Design a protein around this ligand. Sequence first.
Ligand SMILES: NC(=O)c1ccc[n+]([C@@H]2O[C@H](COP(=O)([O-])OP(=O)(O)OC[C@H]3O[C@@H](n4cnc5c(N)ncnc54)[C@H](O)[C@@H]3O)[C@@H](O)[C@H]2O)c1
Ligand SMILES: NC(=O)c1ccc[n+]([C@@H]2O[C@H](COP(=O)([O-])OP(=O)(O)OC[C@H]3O[C@@H](n4cnc5c(N)ncnc54)[C@H](O)[C@@H]3O)[C@@H](O)[C@H]2O)c1
Ligand SMILES: NC(=O)c1ccc[n+]([C@@H]2O[C@H](COP(=O)([O-])OP(=O)(O)OC[C@H]3O[C@@H](n4cnc5c(N)ncnc54)[C@H](O)[C@@H]3O)[C@@H](O)[C@H]2O)c1
Ligand SMILES: NC(=O)c1ccc[n+]([C@@H]2O[C@H](COP(=O)([O-])OP(=O)(O)OC[C@H]3O[C@@H](n4cnc5c(N)ncnc54)[C@H](O)[C@@H]3O)[C@@H](O)[C@H]2O)c1
Lengths: 314, 311, 313, 309
Amino acid sequence: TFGPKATVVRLTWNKSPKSVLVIKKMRDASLLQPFKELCTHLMEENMIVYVEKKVLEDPAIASDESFGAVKKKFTTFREDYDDISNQIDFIICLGGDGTLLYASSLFQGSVPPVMAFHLGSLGFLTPFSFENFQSQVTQVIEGNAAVVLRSRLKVRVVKEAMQYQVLNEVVIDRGPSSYLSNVDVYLDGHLITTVQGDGVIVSTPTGSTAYAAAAGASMIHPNVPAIMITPICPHSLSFRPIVVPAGVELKIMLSPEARNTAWVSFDGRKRQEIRHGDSISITTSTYPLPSICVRDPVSDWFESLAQCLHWNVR
Amino acid sequence: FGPKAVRLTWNKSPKSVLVIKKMRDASLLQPFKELCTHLMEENMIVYVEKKVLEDPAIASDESFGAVKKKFTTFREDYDDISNQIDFIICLGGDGTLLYASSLFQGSVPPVMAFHLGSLGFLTPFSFENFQSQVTQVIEGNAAVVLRSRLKVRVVKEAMQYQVLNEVVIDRGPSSYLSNVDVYLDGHLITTVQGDGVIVSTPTGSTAYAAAAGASMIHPNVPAIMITPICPHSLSFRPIVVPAGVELKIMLSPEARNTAWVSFDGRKRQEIRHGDSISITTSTYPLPSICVRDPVSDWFESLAQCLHWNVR
Amino acid sequence: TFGPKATVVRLTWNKSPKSVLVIKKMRDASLLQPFKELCTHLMEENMIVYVEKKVLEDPAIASDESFGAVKKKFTTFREDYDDISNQIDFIICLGGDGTLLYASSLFQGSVPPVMAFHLGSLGFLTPFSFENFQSQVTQVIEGNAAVVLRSRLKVRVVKAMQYQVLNEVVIDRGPSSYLSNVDVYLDGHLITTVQGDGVIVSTPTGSTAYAAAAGASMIHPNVPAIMITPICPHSLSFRPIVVPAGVELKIMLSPEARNTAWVSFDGRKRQEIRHGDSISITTSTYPLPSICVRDPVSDWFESLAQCLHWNVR
Amino acid sequence: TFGPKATVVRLTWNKSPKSVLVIKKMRDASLLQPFKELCTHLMEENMIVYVEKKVLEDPAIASDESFGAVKKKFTTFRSNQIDFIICLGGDGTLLYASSLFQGSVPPVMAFHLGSLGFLTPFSFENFQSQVTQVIEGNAAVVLRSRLKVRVVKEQAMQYQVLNEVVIDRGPSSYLSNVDVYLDGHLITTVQGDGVIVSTPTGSTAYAAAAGASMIHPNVPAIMITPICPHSLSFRPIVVPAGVELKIMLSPEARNTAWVSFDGRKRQEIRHGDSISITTSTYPLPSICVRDPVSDWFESLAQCLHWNVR
Ligand SMILES: NC(=O)c1ccc[n+]([C@@H]2O[C@H](COP(=O)([O-])OP(=O)(O)OC[C@H]3O[C@@H](n4cnc5c(N)ncnc54)[C@H](O)[C@@H]3O)[C@@H](O)[C@H]2O)c1
Ligand SMILES: NC(=O)c1ccc[n+]([C@@H]2O[C@H](COP(=O)([O-])OP(=O)(O)OC[C@H]3O[C@@H](n4cnc5c(N)ncnc54)[C@H](O)[C@@H]3O)[C@@H](O)[C@H]2O)c1
Ligand SMILES: NC(=O)c1ccc[n+]([C@@H]2O[C@H](COP(=O)([O-])OP(=O)(O)OC[C@H]3O[C@@H](n4cnc5c(N)ncnc54)[C@H](O)[C@@H]3O)[C@@H](O)[C@H]2O)c1
Ligand SMILES: NC(=O)c1ccc[n+]([C@@H]2O[C@H](COP(=O)([O-])OP(=O)(O)OC[C@H]3O[C@@H](n4cnc5c(N)ncnc54)[C@H](O)[C@@H]3O)[C@@H](O)[C@H]2O)c1
């Protein structure tokens, strides 16, 4: 089950969807007219819409009075203490990949299916074009759409628990330090190696084309159960990225004979510091992120590779 | 798995073991005789390829000939080994185990690989104190790794091969670039221009695929690999695809020269414009017995053979 | 000096050029009309034009009688029989990169400047577009053009055969399906033994060639260097290396090696090297002058952007 | 000329060396005994020695009164005075030496104590004979190229670096967007962590960690290597030593960038700042044990394990 109503690779609703969360790219200019159009349309079939509190306080949305008549029907949440985990049937994302990551931040448990929309530039996780969006949204609502069960990593930080869920990767690297970083990595309680360099890009398949790909990791389809381990410019000619089964335990610590501390980041945010007495535990989460695909998983993955990463051009 | 054969359960006590020896070798004779004499003091039937018994260096010794007469002989010509062997012991190195996969095109009994000197990624058992190890495996206290294999069909205008490490399409005598098209689920995913591609198993991730820049994949990860051989494109990163897909490699219509297909570094065939290669994930894996557990053996192989992250 | 008259980076003619060599891409169809146009234009300034004998015996070169009056004024030469050597002031190439390689094959010593043309192919070493070729060829004839002196490798095979290679010389394994073990000496010292498909020891101008496919870095043709890059080694550490151009390389088969090896010179005639054979590689004293449209750096980076799509988006 | 007296690839002194500078790897307890032994030996041929002031300030250097008498003959300092340099500690010491000599650099005899090291080929065992042979003038050197870097702020600041210059991101977690120009021509913009524009000596450094090839220090070139670029086709490149590189921030760039010289003091560059990199005319001569190429391959074999088994 994914959300209060949606469940499952096709998508089934059982109960008709009535609550939708639209997530905007925060400070942007080209995403005002499409956001207004989408919100106006989504409430023409009497369907509850949710909007971040920080979006309605924007000066460029309160100034317009034509949209203000229909804006009052927003089930606003302030994100300070509101748990919208059990209140959303499916999500529409506007702006790019960074929006989808934020969509995974708000749902640390089961997450409803998402429908990412790309409006400008190119997105690897955003397959839907905003043109003719009415028909696509209607088809998604009816229940004729395929999804991919994108894996996520459950990460726990023990300081001498924080319980984060990450989508692309968790990065353990160096911050202001300009020297080598020595980090010990354990798999199932056994020391497998010590990385001596900028850091590691332990990731998910859907993060294989992310920052992991920049460091030399291979392209991994999101339909395989696997966990990547990829360095960041290691000071060793023979440390290639490795792929491990999804059902294993990963642990990451600072080696006892190490100078400087380490810095851990989750999808580019929540950048905190780990010292000698801290530990990071990584597993494969039981709550995947279903993202609706326009036609099918493999074709969308390969077209994203072709357009975004220019994989095998000429 | 076999007639009677993640832990290993025997159900029926093993009695028919096949010992595969590395041909054209001299350091393996004494361990081969020792292992064969030991395996036939528990009244357990052993199998040896016919070409091994006709070796001049093994017929010249009459001490081994007394126990040699109890061998069960197959010649690979018409005496194809079948669901009659429930335990395999391999001597010599990695290429021996590959041969073990060549002999069994269907379900394969569990295999024991011995590294008699040198180093082998797929050979984790040291020959020292082999009596206790073989006894423990015969009893039924041993973990196994189900290595996946690729089912390959060659259609010429069927061959039905099973491969362990990879299938390599490349160029032979040709010195020009090679253009071959690849289909995934009946869809043009790419055309590769260069030497070729090394579509492989996780077991082949550390093989010739690793030579071309492919990543390291544990044999417990259910996926198929696609890595090039020096492509004339900076962007063609090796890719990993689900095990349930079907790959179809052909020659592009606007392609000069023919292509050459090799299965686990073995018999090479030539494919022309009208030929196709279909690759899927086989339903008959290769159970390889591990000394202690899969992960530690894999990482020891990485550290000892490939020198993965030394110093 | 580069040829009988051309000399030197700007090109100085000293004596007015009168002998020109046009090299065609052999079996092709889209190149006949540009070849005919260039040949007709070249002899309206009273330029002696040299053409390969096999080109003039093509079926679609005498079937047209309009061009018949032109073929009578070609100084025909034949491969392996007549050595053109020091008789050509500068060369014009048509068809693509390989033609330039063939241009290096005909001149084992000093070679005249080459004005490469790309026709229906993009090409890394072919920077001239055939459009408005009259002004370009006139400007080159006058003597206002920049030149990139591409280094070449001098290779001797001892079994006393000598070759000059432009892109690289490749020592690899052919019909063998097993690993190839070959030993490399630098200045008489064992620096490495490689266990894999082979090595792509190359010139800078061959860096973007088959060397690049194997993971080599992009090497500008104005740096004096010799590359050594492998072909899929069975080792994660054997990163490609760059050595000074003034060194001696000597490649052999290791004593404990199975099978023989195969040596190829610029993707051409392949020889077999056994245990008793040796390959000696140095930097030649006869570079290949290649005329450039604007200047070496911008042309190199444009070739990287168009051909190899270096850093797109 | 390299220093007041040393000149040149063989090394010729012309005038007998008399002033030598010893550089110690800061606080390293393993180097105290070699430092004392070397300083005692160097002042038995009546040869002037130079030491950093902070080395004598070490609490565990005046406690031993045996070395105090030897200590009192140090020409301590807190150019044009040092004939050649002896380095103890490892690779990072040599870089520090290049920091002290922004102009002509005297030859350096690097020693590896407690570390293996790439640029430190001399073993401390039997150091008497090695130092004597160096003093006599029977030794070969390699002329390691350096990069001259000028930072222009919209305040000129010159620098000479030995390994590389790194233009990366600091605390920022987003991609860094920086434009690079060669001879006034925009060659590319890089979309990632940064660039590792380097020397051949730095080819085995942090540049090698990002996928750059090894270049022998006798090959004149300037390397450009990314740091995990967000592109599959940005292969590292080399350029002739005679070119001029100019790195800036693109006009449509978020966040700033940080420039680091050999792993030292980090500066911040805004949109109005520029970095100009050329090949310096003052190389760093480092004396070799036997010959350049064999020492380079020895360092590749035991430091980076290049092509093992
Ligand atoms: N060197 C690099 O390429 C680099 C550096 C830092 C962070 N990252 C990645 O950026 C992400 C954080 O996103 P942001 O907050 O900057 O938002 P964003 O959308 O601005 O992401 C930045 C860029 O990365 C791309 N991207 C993001 N996720 C991707 C994925 N899964 N596959 C392919 N491309 C992807 C985006 O399309 C965009 O081009 C993390 O996934 C992190 O790994 C990459
Ligand atoms: N460039 C290369 O690395 C290269 C070239 C050709 C063939 N191969 C491999 O050789 C094998 C053919 O077997 P053969 O009997 O002719 O050779 P072999 O058994 O003599 O193997 C040759 C080398 O490859 C290693 N090897 C073989 N299979 C391996 C695996 N699965 N993982 C890691 N290392 C492995 C062996 O340990 C040995 O070092 C195929 O697996 C093929 O991929 C590799
Ligand atoms: N895997 C590969 O990429 C590969 C394989 C074999 C040969 N080659 C190269 O092919 C050439 C043999 O000449 P041919 O007449 O058979 O080829 P060709 O003229 O048919 O050209 C083949 C391709 O290689 C490119 N190319 C050739 N030389 C180049 C260079 N110096 N820099 C960049 N790109 C270059 C061409 O642009 C074209 O794309 C040699 O340079 C050899 O290195 C490359
Ligand atoms: N990811 C990396 O590999 C990385 C990261 C930051 C800095 N660095 C390098 O560290 C150096 C900063 O100086 P430091 O005071 O930290 O010195 P250091 O001796 O502390 O350098 C750290 C490590 O780098 C090695 N090293 C340094 N220069 C080298 C070279 N030219 N070739 C091969 N190995 C070399 C040293 O031997 C040591 O193992 C710079 O050369 C910089 O490029 C490397």
